[PDB]
Structure 1
Amino acid sequence: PRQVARYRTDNGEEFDVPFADDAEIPGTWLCRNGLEGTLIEGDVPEPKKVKPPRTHWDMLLERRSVEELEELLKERLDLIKAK
């Protein structure tokens, strides 16, 4: 035998995939168009633990204090208020 499942991608396209009968279908599948779609039944909404990549703000905080940057911002504002 053979099953069939329906998926949709973020761009709105939908796809069909004949998965196996005795296996368990994943919640997300890499569709033909290359986007990572989701199984339309909508079950098992995992958070996916999608942490953001190391950003510039953290890359700066790793070498500065919360007060020093505020003082620098105050200095810049004072500089422009020379107008």
Structure 2
Amino acid sequence: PRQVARYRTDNGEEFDVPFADDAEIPGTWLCRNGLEGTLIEGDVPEPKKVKPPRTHWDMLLERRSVEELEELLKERLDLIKAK
């Protein structure tokens, strides 16, 4: 009473996961390889509500305004022009 689905990790490996036929097959499955795998059937349904992580630029932007960055850069390039 089982239906088998196949997933493919990002690196090429493929894995067989036996499921119950009456269940709804997930689009991604944490594989024995240690990576996420994508179903080889239709979907592939969703983007999965992703949000970009916080970066150094973000932390710098919330204190220095864009203008302040331009003048400081103007200070730096002008120092570079003097040789």
TM-score (norm 2): 0.92
How many Å apart are 1:47 and its aligned residue? 1.8
Take 1:17 and 1:66, find their aligned partners in 2: how far apart are those partners?
Answer: 51
Unaligned runs of 5+ in 1: none
Q: Which has the higher strand share?
A: 2
Alpha-carbon spacing, 1:2–1:56, altered in 2? closer, same or farther (3 Å): same
RMSD: 1.1
Alpha-carbon spacing, 1:60–1:11, altered in 2? closer, same or farther (3 Å): same
How many Å apart are 1:21 and its aligned residue? 1.1
Aligned length: 83
How many Å apart are 1:46 and its aligned residue? 1.4
TM-score (norm 1): 0.92
Structure 1 residue ranges, 4+ long, deviating more than 4 angstroms after superposition: none
Deviations 1:14-46 (A, max 9, x none): 000110111101100001111100111141431
Unaligned runs of 5+ in 2: none
